[PDB]
């Protein structure tokens, strides 16, 4: 089997992407975060504490003849932003453009913190990075890839993210006209349950290429890409009037400004994000101070390519024995 479903920016910034999913019988659709760095499938419910859900559209278990409750399961989870969400698990019909798992843990949202309650435009997430990492208790639950796995046609999905524009996730099959030239794969570490990689080095504009190994995430729920401090200091430093505001919580730089590119290294191969990805916009409404797309992660703990890079690339999540990624550019 496959399945082929459009994601879309949820705002003019592409803040994150949302693509449509449909749970129980007769499906409900609601529209969830991909995400490649974590492992709940979790949403917004008839559960979900009544002033904290504001526009977004929930699941009702209770609607769906194949919901079962999974008895006596509970879920919690901390993202890397502060946010948050706990509840508890039912089993239901899961499809993503045309492919259909039955049996998968849906985790209803009995609280979400503030900043999913502020965002109307996001029901819920869908894990894919490893089920090592899924929250639920006392019984770990797998996630939509992983149940999926097995029935595709080839152990794999992409991710196909538009800049300012929707795009695509596939299961099951690798489209060869969506992306140029060759796709380049890379060795995984699950060791941490991430999508985890060693990007080659990395280039600011039309500067030389600096031969470094990077070690990071490809994680399709981060907005930014975040990278050493070293690295993001050359980076900005091509940039007129640019600095790191401590009061802001990052770098910022002119909206008058024309931003380089970057270039991160894949093997001997190359993806370029073009300036304009990086630019997210001004600080505040009617300021002339934007903020940056590339960030450090000197406070993370863990370097993280998000959708500013991913963006720039057809990117293969190989899910095989031992697990790989692909980048193409495109």
Do not use: M
């Not at 640019?242 to 024309?258: H, I, L, R």
């Not at 991913?310 to 495109?330: D, Y």
């Amino acid at each position: 089997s496959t399945g082929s479903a459009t994601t879309t920016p949820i705002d003019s910034l592409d803040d994150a992407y949302i693509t449509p999913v449909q749970i129980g019988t007769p499906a409900q659709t609601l529209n969830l975060d991909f995400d490649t760095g974590s492992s709940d499938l979790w949403v917004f419910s008839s559960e979900t504490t009544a002033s904290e859900v504001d526009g977004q559209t929930i699941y009702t278990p209770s609607k769906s003849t194949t919901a079962k409750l999974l008895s006596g399961a509970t879920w919690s989870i901390s993202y890397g932003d502060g946010s948050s969400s706990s509840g508890d698990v039912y089993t239901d019909t899961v499809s993503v453009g045309g492919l259909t798992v039955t049996g998968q843990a849906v985790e209803s949202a009995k609280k979400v913190s503030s900043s999913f309650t502020e965002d109307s435009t996001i029901d819920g997430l869908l894990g894919l990075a490893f089920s090592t990492l899924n929250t639920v208790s006392p019984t770990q639950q797998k996630t939509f890839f992983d149940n999926a796995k097995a029935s595709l046609d080839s152990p794999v999905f992409t991710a196909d993210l538009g800049y300012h524009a929707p795009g695509t996730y596939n299961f099951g099959f690798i489209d060869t006209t969506a992306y140029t030239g060759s796709i380049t794969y890379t060795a995984v570490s699950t060791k941490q349950g991430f999508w985890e990689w060693t990007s080659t080095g990395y280039a600011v504009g039309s500067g030389t290429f600096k031969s470094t190994s990077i070690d990071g995430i490809a994680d399709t729920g981060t907005t930014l890409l975040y990278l050493p401090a070293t690295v993001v200091s050359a980076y900005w430093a091509q940039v007129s009037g640019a600095k790191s505001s401590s009061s802001v919580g990052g770098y910022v730089f002119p909206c008058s400004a024309t931003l380089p590119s970057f270039t991160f290294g894949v093997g001997s191969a190359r993806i370029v994000i073009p300036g304009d990805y990086i630019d997210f916009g001004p600080i505040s409404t009617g300021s002339s101070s934007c903020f940056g797309g590339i960030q450090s992660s000197a406070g993370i703990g863990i370097n993280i390519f998000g959708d500013v890079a991913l963006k720039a690339a057809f990117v293969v999540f190989n899910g095989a024995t031992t697990p790989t990624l692909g980048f193409a550019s495109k």
